[PDB]
Amino acid sequence: SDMTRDGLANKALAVARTLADSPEIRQGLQKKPQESGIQAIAEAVRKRNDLLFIVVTDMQSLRYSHPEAQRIGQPFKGDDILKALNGEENVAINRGFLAQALRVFTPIYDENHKQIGVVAIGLELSRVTQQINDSR
């Protein structure tokens, strides 16, 4: 929620970027959610907190990644991408049993500064309340 707001924004944007930066990526974009290969940005899943919906999207949003399977298939017309899909930063809250979590939005360029896809990163949240209450 709050804590993730600032560091997940930065901390998860960057590790999500090491793998969203690999090659399977532009090639995942050449594919869709259920057949992509979001397992490497998940390399960002591990470094961040063993959890997240670290998603790279073809031009079709959807949590490519997530600990729970059902929260994935939901996100759509979320309108948060309407700004990123076309180049723009945006963050919003999701709300499901234990799923209460924050997520950021980022755009993908065809490699010409031309917006063609979006990178979202949702922190499922949970094993963190303690740290979130005293420190933040």
Say how many residues make up the chain: 136
Which residues does the annotation place in the binding site for (R)-malate?
63-66, 77, 96-98, 103
User: Do residues 49 and 123 lie in contact, with contact meaning Cβ atoms separated by under 8 Å?
Assistant: yes
CA trace torsion 14, 67, 40, 15 (10° rounding): 10
Alpha-carbon distance of 107 to 118, in angstroms, equals 4
- Specify the CATH number of the domain 1-136: 3.30.450.20
Q: At which residue do the structure tokens 């670290």 appear? A: 54
Binding-site residue numbers are: 63-66, 77, 96-98, 103
List the determination method. NMR
Number of H helices, E strands in the chain: 6, 4
Q: In what order do the strands lie in the sheet with 90-94?
A: 53-57, 115-123, 101-109, 90-94
**Pairing between strand 115-123 and 53-57?**
antiparallel
Q: What are phi and psi of 77, to 5 degrees?
A: 50, 10
Residue 36 to residue 16: CA distance in whole angstroms: 15
Residue 54, classed as helix, strand or coil, is strand
Question: Domain residue spans in the chain?
Answer: 1-136
Separation in Å, CA 89 to CA 20, 26, 61, 118, 119: 16, 20, 15, 10, 10
